[PDB]
Design a binder for this molecule. Structure first.
Ligand SMILES: Nc1nonc1C(=O)N[C@@H]1CC[C@H](O)C1
Ligand SMILES: Nc1nonc1C(=O)N[C@@H]1CC[C@H](O)C1
Lengths: 240, 240
């Protein structure tokens, strides 16, 4: 299930971070994922290739200039053809979570608009953007890292790209060599070779860690009978 | 207030995305921000420079190999000297928000450990990591994008780096040229040159957008008298 992602960015070279390295770099090289960038600076006409503009109403800060950005977006939409969802990354957007990632991953084509400076004209959001998404409640210098984050997360859902959380829980602890590290030993159950006991231990650990660190995540879950039991056990041991 | 950030990563070249471009790239060039990377692959001793290892207990997936990663971390700590906070980026960590960013930005030195594969040995977290942080409740292919995200967010707090939210609200809409765009006009108040009316309009817009999109964010705020009034006005107009 190929995925095509168009990107509008003043700094297209930043995306080398995901297109040239690791799992996502392999996905691109194998044509499982295609990332195509358009730079508003290429759509300027003035001598100094101006890509920012002053906000009506004054105040400090600049906005992205409308014409170059708008033209870049239109060009990306033309290349994308029918059925591309246009996304603007910003703190005003829907909060991204794994459920949201799975939904976005259902799209065969995405166009990601990366804001810089104080952002983009509200009317462009109204006329060009299908959805607004945020990767988190913090403020960055640009939308590029959010876009790459989104790309990385959805890429994991593409068949062939890959060689807890899916039940809404934090991950269990992981152990590798050596058997003893600064006096700390690997839990014996992991050495037992008892697949069922290992499965239950990992699940119990996930339930316990979710409960201790992120109890609000549990309220949103319909635990299985097995999960209810193991969580009760973990809570009992914690209270022991 | 200089900031030094040590990074442990199998893909140090990804960090060119923030050290070579934009506001963060300028911060680095001007020595306001220093980013220094250590690669566990450089701390391997076997012919094929192995950086992953099999998890005790079996199951699919690999973990980062302990020895190369541990040695890389120790080297970064030695370079950092006293007072460096060591952070591991992972979904099991404290959820990052702007309040959390401000807290992290108080550190003069940070060391950021970027996990790959299924993660790192739990005992390394116990023995080497000061704090665990998450950039969001979604799953990525590596900790590098989270690390860069964290770096970008804290960099904004470094004096000289910069040329909604600080009151806990979403941003107001922004407008730039032209005055009319696809039939949509700039709100006349922004053209008035009345600084006080413009300030109040922007604040009212932020309150309204926070209320409509992220009402849970309001519950955590102690609104000023002015904010209470403007929010009431916005809600009244919405109900008109
Ligand atoms: N959080 C986020 N999720 O997506 N984007 C952001 C974000 O911080 N955007 C910044 C706002 C001003 C600057 O233009 C870029
Ligand atoms: N969310 C996050 N905030 O910090 N890090 C992550 C994250 O998804 N880490 C991945 C887990 C497995 C892989 O090793 C990298």
């Amino acid at each position: 299930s190929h995925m095509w992602i168009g990107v509008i960015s003043l700094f297209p070279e930043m995306f080398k971070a995901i297109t040239e390295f690791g799992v996502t770099g392999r996905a691109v090289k194998h044509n499982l994922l295609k990332v195509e960038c358009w730079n508003p600076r290429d759509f300027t006409f003035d001598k100094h290739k101006t890509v920012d503009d002053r906000p009506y109403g004054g105040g400090p800060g600049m906005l992205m200039m409308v014409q170059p950005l708008r033209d870049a977006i239109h060009t990306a939409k033309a290349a994308a053809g029918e059925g591309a969802k246009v996304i603007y990354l910003s703190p005003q957007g829907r909060k991204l979570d794994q459920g949201g990632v799975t939904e976005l991953a259902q799209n065969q084509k995405l166009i990601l608009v990366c804001g810089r400076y104080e952002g983009i004209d509200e009317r462009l959001i109204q006329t060009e953007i299908d959805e607004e998404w945020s990767i988190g409640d913090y403020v960055l210098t640009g939308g590029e890292l959010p876009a790459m984050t989104l790309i990385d997360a959805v890429a994991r859902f593409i068949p062939g790209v890959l060689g807890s959380f899916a039940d809404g829980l934090l991950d269990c602890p992981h152990y590798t060599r050596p058997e003893v590290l600064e006096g700390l030993t690997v839990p014996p159950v992991l050495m037992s070779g008892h697949h069922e006991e290992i499965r239950k231990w990992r699940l119990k650990q996930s339930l316990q860690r979710t409960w201790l660190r992120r109890p609000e995540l549990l309220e949103g879950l319909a635990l299985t009978d097995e999960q209810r039991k193991l969580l009760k056990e973990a809570q009992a041991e914690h209270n022991s």
